[PDB]
Amino acid sequence: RCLHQSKAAYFSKASALSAGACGYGSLALGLSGGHLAAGVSSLYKDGAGCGACFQIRCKDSTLCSSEGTRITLTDLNHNNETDFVLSSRAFMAMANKGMGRDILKLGIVDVEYKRIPCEYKNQNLAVRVEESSQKPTYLAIKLMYQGGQTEVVAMDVAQVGSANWNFMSRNHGAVWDTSRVPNGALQFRFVVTSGFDGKWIWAKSVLPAEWKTGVIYDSGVQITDIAKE
């Protein structure tokens, strides 16, 4: 990881709860522990950045703690001013104890941040079936709890136990889909970046034959790889 200098602003919780570019919807609050953030294009990475974890701290010597806090990218920041726009909770969490309301007064603050491994204790990478799916003909899925410090750059699906693999498309954000949906239970393969190289992660059993929309399915795997910067 490198060390980056920028500014950060923040938005009301209603802008946070409201759906961001990654497609997490209301699940974004739990995913980030309340510490969700919108990031500029080079961090959003056209949705590949979704779920990237950061350590961020601010530089006001009176108001800011030295440790800072953790944030999770769940949105794309459109402003031409800051690298991040944090949730209210994330912004407050940057201050010394007792100074949360004080730091909120600033609106913007200089910050310093680095990419760090995401850690979902006792929780594997999971695959949620999005409501826009149409069970036989069309499958839309959303990756949840992507651990480590890397990016899923390509993705394959196939019937459990089949060798006929065919690719998924990143539709937008953390949402991938296909309208060539194999029958029966489904297995996935992810291309992840480790150092500079591609690495395959094989999830042998993910979606049951009778998969339902709105359900989050344990993929049986977790990512720990780190992409060089």
Side-chain angles (χ1 to χ4, degrees):
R1 59 208 49 101
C2 283
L3 207 29
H4 303 270
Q5 314 291 321
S6 188
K7 310 157 174 0
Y10 71 98
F11 39 51
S12 97
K13 205 205 149 156
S15 324
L17 82 80
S18 82
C22 292
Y24 294 130
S26 93
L27 294 196
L29 261 308
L31 190 49
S32 68
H35 288 200
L36 64 160
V40 277
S41 146
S42 50
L43 301 177
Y44 183 63
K45 282 162 159 245
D46 258 308
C50 289
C53 297
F54 292 89
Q55 192 67 40
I56 187 168
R57 88 225 164 101
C58 49
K59 299 168 115 210
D60 182 311
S61 53
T62 310
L63 273 50
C64 297
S65 63
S66 99
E67 42 267 88
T69 190
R70 289 168 141 274
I71 55 162
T72 305
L73 193 144
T74 68
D75 200 359
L76 165 70
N77 167 22
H78 319 285
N79 76 41
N80 267 113
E81 322 280 10
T82 63
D83 279 11
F84 289 105
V85 179
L86 316 185
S87 59
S88 207
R89 266 192 70 180
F91 207 78
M92 289 183 85
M94 272 177 330
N96 294 305
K97 268 154 302 306
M99 300 185 129
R101 310 123 193 264
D102 278 273
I103 212 186
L104 287 175
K105 287 290 279 276
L106 299 166
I108 322 98
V109 63
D110 293 330
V111 294
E112 158 147 36
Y113 69 90
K114 69 184 135 97
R115 180 97 192 268
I116 81 192
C118 296
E119 287 295 340
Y120 302 94
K121 204 109 209 171
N122 287 341
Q123 174 62 68
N124 282 341
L125 174 71
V127 172
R128 192 189 184 265
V129 178
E130 299 292 288
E131 282 90 356
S132 49
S133 313
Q134 305 299 340
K135 163 72 147 46
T137 46
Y138 174 70
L139 172 71
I141 55 142
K142 181 167 61 221
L143 297 188
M144 311 264 285
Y145 323 119
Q146 175 188 138
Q149 187 179 325
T150 188
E151 328 215 300
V152 179
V153 313
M155 183 188 302
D156 258 17
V157 67
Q159 190 158 17
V160 169
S162 163
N164 298 346
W165 290 101
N166 252 292
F167 72 78
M168 315 270 305
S169 282
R170 184 206 302 293
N171 181 245
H172 70 283
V175 171
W176 305 67
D177 67 359
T178 188
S179 59
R180 286 304 125 210
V181 186
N183 284 128
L186 301 176
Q187 60 170 328
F188 291 95
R189 257 189 207 262
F190 316 103
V191 180
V192 152
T193 303
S194 188
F196 298 112
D197 228 348
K199 171 202 248 228
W200 294 91
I201 316 286
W202 186 0
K204 259 297 325 189
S205 195
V206 187
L207 292 189
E210 188 53 38
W211 47 263
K212 298 170 42 122
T213 68
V215 178
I216 304 177
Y217 294 94
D218 194 305
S219 70
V221 302
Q222 242 313 359
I223 304 157
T224 62
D225 301 276
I226 305 182
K228 285 287 175 161
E229 218 172 339

mmCIF file of all heavy atoms in Angstrom, residues 116-147:
data_model
loop_
_atom_site.group_PDB
_atom_site.id
_atom_site.type_symbol
_atom_site.label_atom_id
_atom_site.label_comp_id
_atom_site.label_asym_id
_atom_site.label_seq_id
_atom_site.Cartn_x
_atom_site.Cartn_y
_atom_site.Cartn_z
ATOM 1 N N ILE A 116 -6.355 -0.907 2.891
ATOM 2 C CA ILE A 116 -6.048 -1.941 3.878
ATOM 3 C C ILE A 116 -6.921 -3.165 3.629
ATOM 4 O O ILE A 116 -7.943 -3.091 2.924
ATOM 5 C CB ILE A 116 -6.235 -1.443 5.338
ATOM 6 C CG1 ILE A 116 -7.710 -1.485 5.762
ATOM 7 C CG2 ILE A 116 -5.639 -0.047 5.547
ATOM 8 C CD1 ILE A 116 -8.017 -0.752 7.062
ATOM 9 N N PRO A 117 -6.538 -4.319 4.185
ATOM 10 C CA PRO A 117 -7.360 -5.528 4.031
ATOM 11 C C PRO A 117 -8.718 -5.388 4.693
ATOM 12 O O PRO A 117 -8.835 -4.933 5.836
ATOM 13 C CB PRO A 117 -6.527 -6.620 4.721
ATOM 14 C CG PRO A 117 -5.147 -6.124 4.682
ATOM 15 C CD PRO A 117 -5.227 -4.629 4.788
ATOM 16 N N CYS A 118 -9.749 -5.804 3.963
ATOM 17 C CA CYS A 118 -11.071 -5.969 4.549
ATOM 18 C C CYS A 118 -11.101 -7.249 5.369
ATOM 19 O O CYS A 118 -10.500 -8.255 4.987
ATOM 20 C CB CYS A 118 -12.138 -6.023 3.457
ATOM 21 S SG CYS A 118 -12.321 -4.521 2.477
ATOM 22 N N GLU A 119 -11.811 -7.215 6.499
ATOM 23 C CA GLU A 119 -11.843 -8.346 7.429
ATOM 24 C C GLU A 119 -13.268 -8.570 7.908
ATOM 25 O O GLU A 119 -13.795 -7.783 8.700
ATOM 26 C CB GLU A 119 -10.913 -8.116 8.620
ATOM 27 C CG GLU A 119 -9.442 -8.243 8.264
ATOM 28 C CD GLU A 119 -9.079 -9.662 7.842
ATOM 29 O OE1 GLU A 119 -9.846 -10.607 8.182
ATOM 30 O OE2 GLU A 119 -8.037 -9.817 7.156
ATOM 31 N N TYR A 120 -13.882 -9.652 7.460
ATOM 32 C CA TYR A 120 -15.241 -9.985 7.865
ATOM 33 C C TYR A 120 -15.143 -11.242 8.738
ATOM 34 O O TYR A 120 -15.191 -12.372 8.251
ATOM 35 C CB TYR A 120 -16.138 -10.142 6.632
ATOM 36 C CG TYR A 120 -16.194 -8.892 5.757
ATOM 37 C CD1 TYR A 120 -15.341 -8.743 4.661
ATOM 38 C CD2 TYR A 120 -17.084 -7.851 6.041
ATOM 39 C CE1 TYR A 120 -15.388 -7.599 3.861
ATOM 40 C CE2 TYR A 120 -17.136 -6.706 5.253
ATOM 41 C CZ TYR A 120 -16.288 -6.584 4.157
ATOM 42 O OH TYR A 120 -16.328 -5.444 3.362
ATOM 43 N N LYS A 121 -14.966 -11.017 10.040
ATOM 44 C CA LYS A 121 -14.798 -12.074 11.031
ATOM 45 C C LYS A 121 -15.908 -13.115 10.917
ATOM 46 O O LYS A 121 -17.094 -12.782 10.979
ATOM 47 C CB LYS A 121 -14.775 -11.441 12.438
ATOM 48 C CG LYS A 121 -14.057 -12.261 13.533
ATOM 49 C CD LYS A 121 -12.721 -11.629 13.958
ATOM 50 C CE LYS A 121 -11.719 -12.701 14.434
ATOM 51 N NZ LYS A 121 -10.342 -12.163 14.657
ATOM 52 N N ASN A 122 -15.520 -14.379 10.728
ATOM 53 C CA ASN A 122 -16.440 -15.516 10.684
ATOM 54 C C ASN A 122 -17.416 -15.451 9.508
ATOM 55 O O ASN A 122 -18.507 -16.033 9.576
ATOM 56 C CB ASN A 122 -17.234 -15.638 11.993
ATOM 57 C CG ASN A 122 -16.386 -16.142 13.155
ATOM 58 O OD1 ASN A 122 -15.311 -16.724 12.965
ATOM 59 N ND2 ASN A 122 -16.863 -15.898 14.372
ATOM 60 N N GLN A 123 -17.052 -14.756 8.429
ATOM 61 C CA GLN A 123 -17.956 -14.516 7.307
ATOM 62 C C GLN A 123 -17.184 -14.678 6.005
ATOM 63 O O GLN A 123 -16.183 -13.993 5.775
ATOM 64 C CB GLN A 123 -18.596 -13.121 7.402
ATOM 65 C CG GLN A 123 -19.450 -12.744 6.193
ATOM 66 C CD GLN A 123 -20.629 -13.676 5.994
ATOM 67 O OE1 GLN A 123 -21.558 -13.705 6.801
ATOM 68 N NE2 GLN A 123 -20.581 -14.473 4.922
ATOM 69 N N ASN A 124 -17.650 -15.579 5.157
ATOM 70 C CA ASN A 124 -17.032 -15.800 3.866
ATOM 71 C C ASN A 124 -17.542 -14.794 2.852
ATOM 72 O O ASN A 124 -18.560 -14.123 3.065
ATOM 73 C CB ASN A 124 -17.351 -17.200 3.363
ATOM 74 C CG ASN A 124 -16.518 -18.224 4.028
ATOM 75 O OD1 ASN A 124 -15.480 -17.887 4.596
ATOM 76 N ND2 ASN A 124 -16.979 -19.471 4.030
ATOM 77 N N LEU A 125 -16.831 -14.711 1.727
ATOM 78 C CA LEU A 125 -17.399 -14.096 0.539
ATOM 79 C C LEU A 125 -18.771 -14.689 0.278
ATOM 80 O O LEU A 125 -18.953 -15.908 0.317
ATOM 81 C CB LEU A 125 -16.497 -14.326 -0.666
ATOM 82 C CG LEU A 125 -17.046 -13.850 -2.006
ATOM 83 C CD1 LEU A 125 -17.020 -12.331 -2.018
ATOM 84 C CD2 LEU A 125 -16.221 -14.411 -3.168
ATOM 85 N N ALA A 126 -19.747 -13.822 0.038
ATOM 86 C CA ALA A 126 -21.114 -14.265 -0.146
ATOM 87 C C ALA A 126 -21.640 -13.706 -1.457
ATOM 88 O O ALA A 126 -21.148 -12.702 -1.970
ATOM 89 C CB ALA A 126 -21.999 -13.844 1.030
ATOM 90 N N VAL A 127 -22.650 -14.381 -1.996
ATOM 91 C CA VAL A 127 -23.243 -14.041 -3.282
ATOM 92 C C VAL A 127 -24.737 -13.859 -3.068
ATOM 93 O O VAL A 127 -25.441 -14.822 -2.735
ATOM 94 C CB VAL A 127 -22.966 -15.118 -4.349
ATOM 95 C CG1 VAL A 127 -23.747 -14.837 -5.624
ATOM 96 C CG2 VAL A 127 -21.467 -15.191 -4.660
ATOM 97 N N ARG A 128 -25.218 -12.630 -3.257
ATOM 98 C CA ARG A 128 -26.625 -12.292 -3.088
ATOM 99 C C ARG A 128 -27.319 -12.332 -4.441
ATOM 100 O O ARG A 128 -26.749 -11.895 -5.442
ATOM 101 C CB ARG A 128 -26.773 -10.906 -2.451
ATOM 102 C CG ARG A 128 -28.159 -10.598 -1.984
ATOM 103 C CD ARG A 128 -28.315 -9.144 -1.555
ATOM 104 N NE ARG A 128 -29.656 -8.921 -1.029
ATOM 105 C CZ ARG A 128 -30.667 -8.451 -1.751
ATOM 106 N NH1 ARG A 128 -30.506 -8.106 -3.021
ATOM 107 N NH2 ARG A 128 -31.877 -8.361 -1.199
ATOM 108 N N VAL A 129 -28.527 -12.894 -4.483
ATOM 109 C CA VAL A 129 -29.292 -12.931 -5.725
ATOM 110 C C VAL A 129 -30.142 -11.671 -5.786
ATOM 111 O O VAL A 129 -31.010 -11.448 -4.928
ATOM 112 C CB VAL A 129 -30.159 -14.193 -5.833
ATOM 113 C CG1 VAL A 129 -30.968 -14.156 -7.136
ATOM 114 C CG2 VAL A 129 -29.291 -15.445 -5.771
ATOM 115 N N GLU A 130 -29.887 -10.842 -6.792
ATOM 116 C CA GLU A 130 -30.570 -9.564 -6.870
ATOM 117 C C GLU A 130 -31.999 -9.751 -7.364
ATOM 118 O O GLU A 130 -32.320 -10.697 -8.097
ATOM 119 C CB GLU A 130 -29.785 -8.600 -7.759
ATOM 120 C CG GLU A 130 -28.417 -8.375 -7.159
ATOM 121 C CD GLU A 130 -28.506 -7.594 -5.842
ATOM 122 O OE1 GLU A 130 -28.790 -6.375 -5.871
ATOM 123 O OE2 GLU A 130 -28.405 -8.242 -4.766
ATOM 124 N N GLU A 131 -32.867 -8.855 -6.896
ATOM 125 C CA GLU A 131 -34.286 -8.923 -7.202
ATOM 126 C C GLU A 131 -34.579 -8.825 -8.698
ATOM 127 O O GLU A 131 -35.604 -9.337 -9.152
ATOM 128 C CB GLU A 131 -35.001 -7.811 -6.436
ATOM 129 C CG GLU A 131 -35.209 -8.161 -4.956
ATOM 130 C CD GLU A 131 -34.051 -7.721 -4.075
ATOM 131 O OE1 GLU A 131 -33.026 -7.211 -4.609
ATOM 132 O OE2 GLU A 131 -34.167 -7.906 -2.841
ATOM 133 N N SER A 132 -33.706 -8.204 -9.484
ATOM 134 C CA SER A 132 -34.001 -8.095 -10.904
ATOM 135 C C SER A 132 -33.810 -9.412 -11.649
ATOM 136 O O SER A 132 -34.139 -9.478 -12.838
ATOM 137 C CB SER A 132 -33.127 -7.013 -11.522
ATOM 138 O OG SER A 132 -31.782 -7.206 -11.127
ATOM 139 N N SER A 133 -33.281 -10.449 -10.994
ATOM 140 C CA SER A 133 -33.154 -11.749 -11.638
ATOM 141 C C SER A 133 -34.521 -12.282 -12.034
ATOM 142 O O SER A 133 -35.537 -11.923 -11.451
ATOM 143 C CB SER A 133 -32.454 -12.749 -10.718
ATOM 144 O OG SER A 133 -31.286 -12.204 -10.140
ATOM 145 N N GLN A 134 -34.527 -13.152 -13.044
ATOM 146 C CA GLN A 134 -35.719 -13.876 -13.502
ATOM 147 C C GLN A 134 -35.342 -15.353 -13.599
ATOM 148 O O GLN A 134 -34.776 -15.770 -14.613
ATOM 149 C CB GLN A 134 -36.219 -13.353 -14.847
ATOM 150 C CG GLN A 134 -36.507 -11.870 -14.893
ATOM 151 C CD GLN A 134 -37.600 -11.442 -13.907
ATOM 152 O OE1 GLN A 134 -38.394 -12.271 -13.458
ATOM 153 N NE2 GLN A 134 -37.649 -10.140 -13.577
ATOM 154 N N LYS A 135 -35.765 -16.137 -12.597
ATOM 155 C CA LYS A 135 -35.096 -17.371 -12.160
ATOM 156 C C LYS A 135 -34.535 -18.243 -13.274
ATOM 157 O O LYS A 135 -33.379 -18.657 -13.156
ATOM 158 C CB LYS A 135 -36.004 -18.254 -11.289
ATOM 159 C CG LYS A 135 -35.528 -19.730 -11.151
ATOM 160 C CD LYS A 135 -34.293 -19.874 -10.266
ATOM 161 C CE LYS A 135 -34.262 -21.201 -9.464
ATOM 162 N NZ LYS A 135 -34.600 -22.388 -10.288
ATOM 163 N N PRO A 136 -35.256 -18.582 -14.329
ATOM 164 C CA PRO A 136 -34.597 -19.416 -15.353
ATOM 165 C C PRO A 136 -33.691 -18.608 -16.290
ATOM 166 O O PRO A 136 -32.558 -19.009 -16.566
ATOM 167 C CB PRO A 136 -35.766 -20.083 -16.091
ATOM 168 C CG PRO A 136 -36.985 -19.404 -15.632
ATOM 169 C CD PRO A 136 -36.691 -18.409 -14.555
ATOM 170 N N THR A 137 -34.156 -17.458 -16.768
ATOM 171 C CA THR A 137 -33.546 -16.809 -17.928
ATOM 172 C C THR A 137 -32.439 -15.819 -17.591
ATOM 173 O O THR A 137 -31.578 -15.572 -18.435
ATOM 174 C CB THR A 137 -34.622 -16.067 -18.721
ATOM 175 O OG1 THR A 137 -35.423 -15.318 -17.797
ATOM 176 C CG2 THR A 137 -35.506 -17.043 -19.470
ATOM 177 N N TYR A 138 -32.451 -15.224 -16.401
ATOM 178 C CA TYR A 138 -31.577 -14.099 -16.120
ATOM 179 C C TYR A 138 -31.157 -14.136 -14.657
ATOM 180 O O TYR A 138 -32.016 -14.200 -13.770
ATOM 181 C CB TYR A 138 -32.281 -12.768 -16.446
ATOM 182 C CG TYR A 138 -31.467 -11.564 -16.043
ATOM 183 C CD1 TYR A 138 -30.301 -11.227 -16.729
ATOM 184 C CD2 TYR A 138 -31.849 -10.780 -14.966
ATOM 185 C CE1 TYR A 138 -29.531 -10.122 -16.342
ATOM 186 C CE2 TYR A 138 -31.097 -9.690 -14.569
ATOM 187 C CZ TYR A 138 -29.938 -9.365 -15.247
ATOM 188 O OH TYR A 138 -29.212 -8.274 -14.826
ATOM 189 N N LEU A 139 -29.846 -14.072 -14.409
ATOM 190 C CA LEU A 139 -29.298 -14.073 -13.055
ATOM 191 C C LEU A 139 -28.468 -12.813 -12.822
ATOM 192 O O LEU A 139 -27.525 -12.542 -13.573
ATOM 193 C CB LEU A 139 -28.448 -15.314 -12.816
ATOM 194 C CG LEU A 139 -27.681 -15.300 -11.492
ATOM 195 C CD1 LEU A 139 -28.617 -15.475 -10.298
ATOM 196 C CD2 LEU A 139 -26.646 -16.395 -11.539
ATOM 197 N N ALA A 140 -28.832 -12.041 -11.795
ATOM 198 C CA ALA A 140 -28.055 -10.902 -11.319
ATOM 199 C C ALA A 140 -27.631 -11.194 -9.887
ATOM 200 O O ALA A 140 -28.475 -11.537 -9.042
ATOM 201 C CB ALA A 140 -28.867 -9.602 -11.364
ATOM 202 N N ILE A 141 -26.334 -11.066 -9.612
ATOM 203 C CA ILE A 141 -25.790 -11.363 -8.293
ATOM 204 C C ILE A 141 -24.960 -10.181 -7.824
ATOM 205 O O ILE A 141 -24.492 -9.361 -8.621
ATOM 206 C CB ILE A 141 -24.944 -12.660 -8.275
ATOM 207 C CG1 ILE A 141 -23.833 -12.603 -9.324
ATOM 208 C CG2 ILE A 141 -25.809 -13.880 -8.513
ATOM 209 C CD1 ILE A 141 -22.545 -13.216 -8.874
ATOM 210 N N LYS A 142 -24.792 -10.092 -6.505
ATOM 211 C CA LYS A 142 -24.035 -9.007 -5.898
ATOM 212 C C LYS A 142 -23.049 -9.602 -4.907
ATOM 213 O O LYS A 142 -23.452 -10.276 -3.955
ATOM 214 C CB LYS A 142 -24.972 -7.996 -5.228
ATOM 215 C CG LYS A 142 -24.250 -6.818 -4.586
ATOM 216 C CD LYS A 142 -25.206 -5.691 -4.210
ATOM 217 C CE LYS A 142 -26.256 -6.125 -3.200
ATOM 218 N NZ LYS A 142 -27.584 -5.539 -3.552
ATOM 219 N N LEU A 143 -21.759 -9.374 -5.136
ATOM 220 C CA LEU A 143 -20.759 -9.892 -4.213
ATOM 221 C C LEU A 143 -20.817 -9.145 -2.887
ATOM 222 O O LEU A 143 -20.816 -7.909 -2.860
ATOM 223 C CB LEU A 143 -19.356 -9.783 -4.813
ATOM 224 C CG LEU A 143 -19.023 -10.557 -6.084
ATOM 225 C CD1 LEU A 143 -17.529 -10.464 -6.399
ATOM 226 C CD2 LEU A 143 -19.469 -12.006 -5.984
ATOM 227 N N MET A 144 -20.826 -9.898 -1.783
ATOM 228 C CA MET A 144 -20.792 -9.319 -0.446
ATOM 229 C C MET A 144 -19.667 -9.897 0.399
ATOM 230 O O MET A 144 -19.322 -11.078 0.295
ATOM 231 C CB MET A 144 -22.109 -9.504 0.275
ATOM 232 C CG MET A 144 -23.286 -9.095 -0.574
ATOM 233 S SD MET A 144 -23.616 -7.419 -0.077
ATOM 234 C CE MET A 144 -24.369 -7.788 1.502
ATOM 235 N N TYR A 145 -19.114 -9.032 1.252
ATOM 236 C CA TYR A 145 -18.052 -9.388 2.188
ATOM 237 C C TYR A 145 -16.815 -9.873 1.447
ATOM 238 O O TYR A 145 -16.312 -10.969 1.680
ATOM 239 C CB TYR A 145 -18.520 -10.434 3.195
ATOM 240 C CG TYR A 145 -19.942 -10.275 3.649
ATOM 241 C CD1 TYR A 145 -20.867 -11.283 3.417
ATOM 242 C CD2 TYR A 145 -20.361 -9.134 4.344
ATOM 243 C CE1 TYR A 145 -22.179 -11.170 3.846
ATOM 244 C CE2 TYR A 145 -21.688 -9.002 4.773
ATOM 245 C CZ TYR A 145 -22.584 -10.024 4.521
ATOM 246 O OH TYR A 145 -23.895 -9.925 4.929
ATOM 247 N N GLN A 146 -16.338 -9.053 0.525
ATOM 248 C CA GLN A 146 -15.146 -9.389 -0.242
ATOM 249 C C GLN A 146 -13.956 -9.027 0.622
ATOM 250 O O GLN A 146 -13.662 -7.844 0.812
ATOM 251 C CB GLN A 146 -15.114 -8.635 -1.565
ATOM 252 C CG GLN A 146 -13.850 -8.864 -2.345
ATOM 253 C CD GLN A 146 -13.737 -7.983 -3.559
ATOM 254 O OE1 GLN A 146 -12.652 -7.472 -3.810
ATOM 255 N NE2 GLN A 146 -14.835 -7.783 -4.315
ATOM 256 N N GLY A 147 -13.267 -10.059 1.170
ATOM 257 C CA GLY A 147 -12.147 -9.842 2.065
ATOM 258 C C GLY A 147 -10.864 -9.495 1.334
ATOM 259 O O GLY A 147 -10.774 -9.524 0.108
#
